[PDB]
Amino acid sequence: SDRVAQLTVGNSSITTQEAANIVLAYGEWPEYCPDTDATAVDKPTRPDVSVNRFYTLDSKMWQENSTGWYWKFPDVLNKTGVFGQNAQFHYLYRSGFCLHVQCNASKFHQGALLVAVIPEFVIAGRGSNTKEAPHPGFTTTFPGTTGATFYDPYVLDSGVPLSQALIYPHQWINLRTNNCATVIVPYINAVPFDSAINHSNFGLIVIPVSPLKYSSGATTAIPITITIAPLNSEFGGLRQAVS
Amino acid sequence: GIPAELRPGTNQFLTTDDGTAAPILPGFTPTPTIHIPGEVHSLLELCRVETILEVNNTTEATGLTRLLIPVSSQNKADELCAAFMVDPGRIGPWQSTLVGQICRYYTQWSGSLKVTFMFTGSFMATGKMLVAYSPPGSAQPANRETAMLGTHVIWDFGLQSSVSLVIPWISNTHFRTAKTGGNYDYYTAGVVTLWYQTNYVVPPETPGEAYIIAMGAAQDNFTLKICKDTDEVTQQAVLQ
Amino acid sequence: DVLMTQTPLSLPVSLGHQASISCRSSQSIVHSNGNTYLEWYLQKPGQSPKLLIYTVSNRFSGVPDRFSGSGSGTDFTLRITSVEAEDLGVYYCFQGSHIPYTFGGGTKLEI
Amino acid sequence: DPVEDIIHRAISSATNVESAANTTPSSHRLETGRVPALQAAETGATSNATDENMIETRCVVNRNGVLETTINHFFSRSGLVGVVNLTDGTTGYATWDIDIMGFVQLRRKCEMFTYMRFNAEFTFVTTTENGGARPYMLQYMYVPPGAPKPTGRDAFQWQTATNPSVFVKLTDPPAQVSVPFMSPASAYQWFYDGYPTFGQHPETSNTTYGLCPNNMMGTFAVRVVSREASQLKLQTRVYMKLKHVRAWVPRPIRSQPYLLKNFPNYDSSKITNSARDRSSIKQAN
Amino acid sequence: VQLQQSGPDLVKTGASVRVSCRASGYSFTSYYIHWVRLNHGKSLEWIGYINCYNGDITYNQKFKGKASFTLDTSSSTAYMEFNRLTSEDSAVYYCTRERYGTPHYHFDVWGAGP
Amino acid sequence: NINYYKDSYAASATRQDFTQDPKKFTQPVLDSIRELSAPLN
Numbered sequence A: 001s002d003r004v005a006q007l008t009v010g011n012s013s014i015t016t017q018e019a020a021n022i023v024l025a026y027g028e029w030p031e032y033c034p035d036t037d038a039t040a041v042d043k044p045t046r047p048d049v050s051v052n053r054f055y056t057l058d059s060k061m062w063q064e065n066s067t068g069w070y071w072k073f074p075d076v077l078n079k080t081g082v083f084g085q086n087a088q089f090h091y092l093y094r095s096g097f098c099l100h101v102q103c104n105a106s107k108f109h110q111g112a113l114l115v116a117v118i119p120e121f122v123i124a125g126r127g128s129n130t131k132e133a134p135h136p137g138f139t140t141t142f143p144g145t146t147g148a149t150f151y152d153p154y155v156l157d158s159g160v161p162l163s164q165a166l167i168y169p170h171q172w173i174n175l176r177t178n179n180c181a182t183v184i185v186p187y188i189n190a191v192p193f194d195s196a197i198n199h200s201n202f203g204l205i206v207i208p209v210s211p212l213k214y215s216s217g218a219t220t221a222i223p224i225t226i227t228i229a230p231l232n233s234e235f236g237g238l239r240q241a242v243s
Numbered sequence B: 001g002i003p004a005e006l007r008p009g010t011n012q013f014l015t016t017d018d019g020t021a022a023p024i025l026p027g028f029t030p031t032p033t034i035h036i037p038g039e040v041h042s043l044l045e046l047c048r049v050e051t052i053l054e055v056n057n058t059t060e061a062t063g064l065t066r067l068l069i070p071v072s073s074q075n076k077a078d079e080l081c082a083a084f085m086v087d088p089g090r091i092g093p094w095q096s097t098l099v100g101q102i103c104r105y106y107t108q109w110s111g112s113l114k115v116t117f118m119f120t121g122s123f124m125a126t127g128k129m130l131v132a133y134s135p136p137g138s139a140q141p142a143n144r145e146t147a148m149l150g151t152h153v154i155w156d157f158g159l160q161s162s163v164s165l166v167i168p169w170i171s172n173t174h175f176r177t178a179k180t181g182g183n184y185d186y187y188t189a190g191v192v193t194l195w196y197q198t199n200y201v202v203p204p205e206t207p208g209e210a211y212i213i214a215m216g217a218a219q220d221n222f223t224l225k226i227c228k229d230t231d232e233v234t235q236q237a238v239l240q
Numbered sequence C: 001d002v003l004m005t006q007t008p009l010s011l012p013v014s015l016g017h018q019a020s021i022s023c024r025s026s027q028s029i030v031h032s033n034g035n036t037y038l039e040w041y042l043q044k045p046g047q048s049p050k051l052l053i054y055t056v057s058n059r060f061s062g063v064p065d066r067f068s069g070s071g072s073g074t075d076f077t078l079r080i081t082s083v084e085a086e087d088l089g090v091y092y093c094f095q096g097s098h099i100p101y102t103f104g105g106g107t108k109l110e111i
Numbered sequence D: 001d002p003v004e005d006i007i008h009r010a011i012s013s014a015t016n017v018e019s020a021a022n023t024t025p026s027s028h029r030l031e032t033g034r035v036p037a038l039q040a041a042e043t044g045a046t047s048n049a050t051d052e053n054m055i056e057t058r059c060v061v062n063r064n065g066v067l068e069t070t071i072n073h074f075f076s077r078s079g080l081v082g083v084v085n086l087t088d089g090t091t092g093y094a095t096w097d098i099d100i101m102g103f104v105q106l107r108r109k110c111e112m113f114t115y116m117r118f119n120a121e122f123t124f125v126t127t128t129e130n131g132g133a134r135p136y137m138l139q140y141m142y143v144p145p146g147a148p149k150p151t152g153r154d155a156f157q158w159q160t161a162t163n164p165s166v167f168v169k170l171t172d173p174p175a176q177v178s179v180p181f182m183s184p185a186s187a188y189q190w191f192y193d194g195y196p197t198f199g200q201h202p203e204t205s206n207t208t209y210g211l212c213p214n215n216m217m218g219t220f221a222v223r224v225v226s227r228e229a230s231q232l233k234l235q236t237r238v239y240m241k242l243k244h245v246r247a248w249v250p251r252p253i254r255s256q257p258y259l260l261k262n263f264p265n266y267d268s269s270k271i272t273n274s275a276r277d278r279s280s281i282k283q284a285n
Numbered sequence E: 001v002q003l004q005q006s007g008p009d010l011v012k013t014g015a016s017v018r019v020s021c022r023a024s025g026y027s028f029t030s031y032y033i034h035w036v037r038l039n040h041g042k043s044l045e046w047i048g049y050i051n052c053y054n055g056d057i058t059y060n061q062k063f064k065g066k067a068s069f070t071l072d073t074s075s076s077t078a079y080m081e082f083n084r085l086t087s088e089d090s091a092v093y094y095c096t097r098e099r100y101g102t103p104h105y106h107f108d109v110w111g112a113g114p
Numbered sequence F: 001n002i003n004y005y006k007d008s009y010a011a012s013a014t015r016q017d018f019t020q021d022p023k024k025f026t027q028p029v030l031d032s033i034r035e036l037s038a039p040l041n
Ligand SMILES: CCCCCCCCCCCCC/C=C/[C@H](O)[C@H](N)CO
Pocket: B024, D098, D099, D100, D101, D120, D122, D140, D141, D142, D164, D165, D166, D177, D179, D182, D188, D189, D190, D215, D217, D220
């Protein structure tokens, strides 16, 4: 009566039977823009059922020798669904997110992931020059739908050690107790609205801490999906198409 | 006008003092605030968040393997699994937590602590693990029948996966200067050995090593006193 | 950068002292951790090279008490007090601050 | 009667804290079903096993102070943020783009928080580079973004028609001003992901990455007031004290050494650990 | 803990040699592997290093375009060498080991020679 | 509690804060667990 939970947004529910709990990020629900904050003087065009539903990304494989993966939000939705056709026409943007990571296993496997949400996530270059100087490419700072791999998971590509990285919102995926993790993030940004294509707010991270071990004979391909979904999103400021 | 003699203290520049100074822009109204979630008000809402210790800080482990303690099915009982100190502000395992990075900006900590363990093993494997703690004065304990004198919590694996030892505040002084050496060994605080209680029993065709992740935090009566300037910084240039 | 071992041929007598030095260098204190590296290396003429004093002063395990080495700035010395019948190889100095890692020339011993 | 479906709070609660928390006594428990020690760290919330529920404790009235940990008293100490070198007799003046990312003692503190908002307070200590300290006149302008940066020792930007300026000697006690909050956003931000413009961004070396435009705050220019060119070398040491500060969204602290001013690079050839190594795992000291 | 290279074979101008080694006795996905050559009666030279997990090849600038490394996951190195040999490169090619998180000293163990 | 100029940012440090609420960083869960119960039940 506390494990089983069904989340239903829009027209696409998600049921699960071995969950743990639901984590709000910094204790505040995602809400609309009150009129002491808004600075645009044109009416925002908020849809309700078209762009508030769970979109499923592509599933990475988890092996013996894996390092990590990371995505950037809301970069990953700029090509799929109606939300990909309302972040190209409209200049401004404002939303929340509601993440979900499935990874199921048997009873004789072991291992544990770490699902976090890091606001304002900057990727840093990896070269010992002081001026030319190395810089990350465009296919690394905005990976797209797939999401690249970490090169150094111990320092998170930023010189921040992993052991201190529970100050962010997070849940564990411990493969003996649960098999799904859920974070609900409100809208954290300085200016009230935001551009939608350049300023990507935050970034999901999955880092396997205790690596996968299994005895001989079990199934060897354990995949990992993501299921995100916006909440209370509103747009504004129409123009022509720029991808 | 009014007669006013001066004092020592004239014409100095003390850094940590708060006085007024003449503004440069008369009649300035700043850009107004909006509601942004997750506001801090103190640095005691950042000492109460459990982060990951670095216990396996030995010669042969490198990388993500440093963060976790290994267990395995022993041949005998009574054996030892890991051991470390309680000194936020001494080199060792506490240097990679938020307590160990904030209690180096300050001197003279106080109050309790807590250590949370999490077991990342399989599902069908059980066991028990004593978790001891002993106040200072002697060396590291030898066998288990000596380390069951101090504070200890016997922990059993099951559907739950966490026990949280609360290391109490047993000290003569009201604070502890958070530095070690020869003359400052008067402010040390003892060892947190993990002992096997019985064994680690495993069914057939199941992996034969599990990994215990240790964590760490601070309790509710945690206070800090004197702001100093830290020592983990490194520079020899101007960052050109 | 570059290194210059100052004595390419030092000819000591047993129960004597040595001073093999590389005067020529850059600042060589960078990599920004402090920690100027400057490792030393024997090479007996039939085997692979081996370690010696690994930072400016610290000894590596297995190295005897005779191998002493110090220095600062751009001056670095080795001092061994009893040249035995084993300490006869070639001495190299390896810096590790900047990116192209350089080993310097070398230093012989013959008596 | 019309279309029907058109018609169709937080968790935290603030508590004042004056002292540290107290401790209420307890006794021994011999009872099944009420277990406070067992937790679940998978749910993300930290444990809450207070020590009244583990061990038998005594009633302790606590009187320690929790005044010197709030962030107003934590940042209100002034540290170095910049050094301007001045050689005369060979252009005559010197500039310094305002950027507090340079010196590492105050950079490492201000990266604990993501979005900040304060009011600075500067102080300019100026010495000749051989401890002479002879009386001259100095002028410190302040060029906001857009005004022309002065080109010569005696061009016509040095007239101070609009923008501020501080005349002070070398023998007086050092100057001090109080710069207010000057950002077009709602708050300063230190970490800005995302390119600043539109267009198409290359693959090899995009040096535009992560440059936040909400912090480009101008230039600080200084010359020596004379007609004849005097012959002297100087340094200034601009200190900065923050006050009235408010912060948001904490994040962990840098652990690797720094390499550049604007960009947060590390060096992946040699990575330093956090904890220095010991001999084995089964011994303490 | 041993590093066992390949047997020495002489090659004339216009081929590759692909000298290997095999890490024996430790965890192979936790160490760099450098490559150091010894000119005849002369000084040592550094070539470059391969990181055993995440790739991350780095050379000198005196050896770019030649001696492009590879990597194997079955406990084996790049086994790689120059594509275009000259007459002077009849040297001896060592291989070494370096800990990932730094221990403040490089090049602890050494290999054989070709 | 005194200010000699007619602007508000030129003053000294203001009054003490004395407030904190750590429940938005320790326990931000929906189903609020208590101290004396099994948290996965
Ligand atoms: C006579 C007064 C001359 C000095 C006037 C300096 C005014 C500019 C100070 C504004 C506050 C500092 C500028 C912003 C702070 C950091 O550098 C940026 N946030 C960098 O991200």
